[PDB]
PDB file of all heavy atoms in Angstrom:
ATOM      1  N   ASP R 140      -2.407  12.991 -18.142  1.00  0.00           N
ATOM      2  CA  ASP R 140      -2.605  12.983 -19.495  1.00  0.00           C
ATOM      3  C   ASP R 140      -3.405  14.142 -20.030  1.00  0.00           C
ATOM      4  O   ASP R 140      -3.417  14.474 -21.243  1.00  0.00           O
ATOM      5  CB  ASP R 140      -3.327  11.777 -20.059  1.00  0.00           C
ATOM      6  CG  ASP R 140      -2.515  10.499 -19.714  1.00  0.00           C
ATOM      7  OD1 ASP R 140      -1.266  10.523 -19.831  1.00  0.00           O
ATOM      8  OD2 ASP R 140      -3.063   9.355 -19.522  1.00  0.00           O
ATOM      9  N   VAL R 141      -4.051  14.872 -19.157  1.00  0.00           N
ATOM     10  CA  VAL R 141      -4.831  16.077 -19.469  1.00  0.00           C
ATOM     11  C   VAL R 141      -3.830  17.332 -19.346  1.00  0.00           C
ATOM     12  O   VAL R 141      -3.476  17.673 -18.193  1.00  0.00           O
ATOM     13  CB  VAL R 141      -5.930  16.219 -18.522  1.00  0.00           C
ATOM     14  CG1 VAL R 141      -6.778  17.543 -18.968  1.00  0.00           C
ATOM     15  CG2 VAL R 141      -6.932  15.146 -18.582  1.00  0.00           C
ATOM     16  N   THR R 142      -3.291  17.764 -20.430  1.00  0.00           N
ATOM     17  CA  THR R 142      -2.194  18.820 -20.461  1.00  0.00           C
ATOM     18  C   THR R 142      -2.719  20.183 -20.776  1.00  0.00           C
ATOM     19  O   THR R 142      -1.874  21.036 -21.029  1.00  0.00           O
ATOM     20  CB  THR R 142      -1.207  18.334 -21.470  1.00  0.00           C
ATOM     21  OG1 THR R 142      -1.810  18.443 -22.778  1.00  0.00           O
ATOM     22  CG2 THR R 142      -0.683  16.889 -21.245  1.00  0.00           C
ATOM     23  N   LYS R 143      -4.042  20.380 -20.443  1.00  0.00           N
ATOM     24  CA  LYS R 143      -4.635  21.664 -20.858  1.00  0.00           C
ATOM     25  C   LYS R 143      -3.869  22.915 -20.154  1.00  0.00           C
ATOM     26  O   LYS R 143      -3.477  23.841 -20.734  1.00  0.00           O
ATOM     27  CB  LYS R 143      -6.083  21.723 -20.506  1.00  0.00           C
ATOM     28  CG  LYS R 143      -6.736  23.111 -20.435  1.00  0.00           C
ATOM     29  CD  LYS R 143      -7.965  23.123 -19.576  1.00  0.00           C
ATOM     30  CE  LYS R 143      -8.277  24.587 -19.191  1.00  0.00           C
ATOM     31  NZ  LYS R 143      -9.627  24.588 -18.517  1.00  0.00           N
ATOM     32  N   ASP R 144      -3.721  22.656 -18.806  1.00  0.00           N
ATOM     33  CA  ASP R 144      -2.957  23.779 -18.085  1.00  0.00           C
ATOM     34  C   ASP R 144      -1.428  23.553 -17.878  1.00  0.00           C
ATOM     35  O   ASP R 144      -0.809  24.440 -17.252  1.00  0.00           O
ATOM     36  CB  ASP R 144      -3.663  23.804 -16.558  1.00  0.00           C
ATOM     37  CG  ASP R 144      -5.033  24.142 -16.543  1.00  0.00           C
ATOM     38  OD1 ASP R 144      -5.431  25.011 -17.429  1.00  0.00           O
ATOM     39  OD2 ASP R 144      -5.779  23.424 -15.855  1.00  0.00           O
ATOM     40  N   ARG R 145      -0.934  22.394 -18.428  1.00  0.00           N
ATOM     41  CA  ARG R 145       0.401  22.127 -18.025  1.00  0.00           C
ATOM     42  C   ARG R 145       1.349  22.180 -19.339  1.00  0.00           C
ATOM     43  O   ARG R 145       2.565  22.564 -19.068  1.00  0.00           O
ATOM     44  CB  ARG R 145       0.501  20.672 -17.639  1.00  0.00           C
ATOM     45  CG  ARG R 145       0.774  20.491 -16.113  1.00  0.00           C
ATOM     46  CD  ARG R 145      -0.349  20.141 -15.211  1.00  0.00           C
ATOM     47  NE  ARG R 145      -0.959  18.886 -15.740  1.00  0.00           N
ATOM     48  CZ  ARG R 145      -1.916  18.185 -15.034  1.00  0.00           C
ATOM     49  NH1 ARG R 145      -2.157  18.556 -13.790  1.00  0.00           N
ATOM     50  NH2 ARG R 145      -2.314  17.051 -15.463  1.00  0.00           N
ATOM     51  N   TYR R 146       0.986  21.894 -20.502  1.00  0.00           N
ATOM     52  CA  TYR R 146       1.930  21.897 -21.649  1.00  0.00           C
ATOM     53  C   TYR R 146       1.882  23.249 -22.201  1.00  0.00           C
ATOM     54  O   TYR R 146       0.872  23.883 -22.479  1.00  0.00           O
ATOM     55  CB  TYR R 146       1.480  20.866 -22.715  1.00  0.00           C
ATOM     56  CG  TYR R 146       2.027  19.450 -22.484  1.00  0.00           C
ATOM     57  CD1 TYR R 146       2.651  19.178 -21.203  1.00  0.00           C
ATOM     58  CD2 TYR R 146       2.051  18.395 -23.412  1.00  0.00           C
ATOM     59  CE1 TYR R 146       3.191  17.839 -20.940  1.00  0.00           C
ATOM     60  CE2 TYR R 146       2.460  17.271 -23.177  1.00  0.00           C
ATOM     61  CZ  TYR R 146       3.080  16.976 -21.991  1.00  0.00           C
ATOM     62  OH  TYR R 146       3.576  15.712 -21.825  1.00  0.00           O
ATOM     63  N   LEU R 147       3.078  23.840 -22.638  1.00  0.00           N
ATOM     64  CA  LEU R 147       3.333  25.088 -23.092  1.00  0.00           C
ATOM     65  C   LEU R 147       3.948  25.072 -24.554  1.00  0.00           C
ATOM     66  O   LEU R 147       4.681  24.044 -24.869  1.00  0.00           O
ATOM     67  CB  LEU R 147       4.422  25.842 -22.309  1.00  0.00           C
ATOM     68  CG  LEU R 147       4.018  26.295 -20.863  1.00  0.00           C
ATOM     69  CD1 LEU R 147       5.176  26.733 -20.198  1.00  0.00           C
ATOM     70  CD2 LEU R 147       2.881  27.313 -20.877  1.00  0.00           C
ATOM     71  N   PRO R 148       3.479  25.939 -25.380  1.00  0.00           N
ATOM     72  CA  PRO R 148       4.129  25.932 -26.723  1.00  0.00           C
ATOM     73  C   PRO R 148       5.348  26.887 -26.780  1.00  0.00           C
ATOM     74  O   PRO R 148       5.603  27.698 -25.893  1.00  0.00           O
ATOM     75  CB  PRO R 148       3.005  26.614 -27.575  1.00  0.00           C
ATOM     76  CG  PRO R 148       2.342  27.423 -26.656  1.00  0.00           C
ATOM     77  CD  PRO R 148       2.378  26.810 -25.231  1.00  0.00           C
ATOM     78  N   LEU R 149       6.168  26.722 -27.770  1.00  0.00           N
ATOM     79  CA  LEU R 149       7.350  27.560 -27.978  1.00  0.00           C
ATOM     80  C   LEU R 149       6.776  29.063 -28.296  1.00  0.00           C
ATOM     81  O   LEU R 149       5.904  29.113 -29.038  1.00  0.00           O
ATOM     82  CB  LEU R 149       8.190  27.006 -28.972  1.00  0.00           C
ATOM     83  CG  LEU R 149       9.014  25.819 -28.649  1.00  0.00           C
ATOM     84  CD1 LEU R 149       9.801  25.311 -29.821  1.00  0.00           C
ATOM     85  CD2 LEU R 149       9.871  25.961 -27.420  1.00  0.00           C
ATOM     86  N   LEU R 150       7.519  29.969 -27.752  1.00  0.00           N
ATOM     87  CA  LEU R 150       7.073  31.370 -28.084  1.00  0.00           C
ATOM     88  C   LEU R 150       7.885  31.896 -29.233  1.00  0.00           C
ATOM     89  O   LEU R 150       9.152  31.891 -29.205  1.00  0.00           O
ATOM     90  CB  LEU R 150       7.303  32.295 -26.855  1.00  0.00           C
ATOM     91  CG  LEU R 150       6.307  32.124 -25.621  1.00  0.00           C
ATOM     92  CD1 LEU R 150       6.802  33.011 -24.466  1.00  0.00           C
ATOM     93  CD2 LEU R 150       4.922  32.324 -26.001  1.00  0.00           C
ATOM     94  N   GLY R 151       7.203  32.524 -30.259  1.00  0.00           N
ATOM     95  CA  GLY R 151       7.825  33.243 -31.264  1.00  0.00           C
ATOM     96  C   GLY R 151       8.165  34.728 -30.813  1.00  0.00           C
ATOM     97  O   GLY R 151       7.820  34.996 -29.639  1.00  0.00           O
ATOM     98  N   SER R 152       8.701  35.404 -31.673  1.00  0.00           N
ATOM     99  CA  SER R 152       9.035  36.872 -31.379  1.00  0.00           C
ATOM    100  C   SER R 152       7.849  37.613 -31.056  1.00  0.00           C
ATOM    101  O   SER R 152       6.937  37.624 -31.778  1.00  0.00           O
ATOM    102  CB  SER R 152       9.841  37.425 -32.547  1.00  0.00           C
ATOM    103  OG  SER R 152      10.985  36.652 -32.808  1.00  0.00           O
ATOM    104  N   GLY R 153       7.853  38.374 -29.940  1.00  0.00           N
ATOM    105  CA  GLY R 153       6.859  39.192 -29.510  1.00  0.00           C
ATOM    106  C   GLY R 153       5.506  38.468 -29.022  1.00  0.00           C
ATOM    107  O   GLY R 153       4.370  38.872 -29.317  1.00  0.00           O
ATOM    108  N   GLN R 154       5.629  37.242 -28.478  1.00  0.00           N
ATOM    109  CA  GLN R 154       4.522  36.458 -28.155  1.00  0.00           C
ATOM    110  C   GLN R 154       4.505  36.113 -26.676  1.00  0.00           C
ATOM    111  O   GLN R 154       5.457  36.091 -26.000  1.00  0.00           O
ATOM    112  CB  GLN R 154       4.531  35.092 -28.965  1.00  0.00           C
ATOM    113  CG  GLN R 154       4.224  35.355 -30.402  1.00  0.00           C
ATOM    114  CD  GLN R 154       3.940  34.054 -31.196  1.00  0.00           C
ATOM    115  OE1 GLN R 154       4.606  32.989 -31.073  1.00  0.00           O
ATOM    116  NE2 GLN R 154       2.771  34.141 -31.910  1.00  0.00           N
ATOM    117  N   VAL R 155       3.214  35.883 -26.255  1.00  0.00           N
ATOM    118  CA  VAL R 155       3.065  35.475 -24.812  1.00  0.00           C
ATOM    119  C   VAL R 155       2.107  34.229 -24.764  1.00  0.00           C
ATOM    120  O   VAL R 155       1.520  33.869 -25.783  1.00  0.00           O
ATOM    121  CB  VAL R 155       2.197  36.663 -24.017  1.00  0.00           C
ATOM    122  CG1 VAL R 155       3.035  37.956 -24.154  1.00  0.00           C
ATOM    123  CG2 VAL R 155       0.823  36.716 -24.584  1.00  0.00           C
TER     124      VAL R 155
END
Side-chain angles (χ1 to χ4, degrees):
Chain R
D140 294 330
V141 181
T142 66
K143 163 200 168 180
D144 296 320
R145 248 107 57 165
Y146 275 13
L147 295 169
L149 293 177
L150 289 178
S152 303
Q154 292 195 307
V155 307

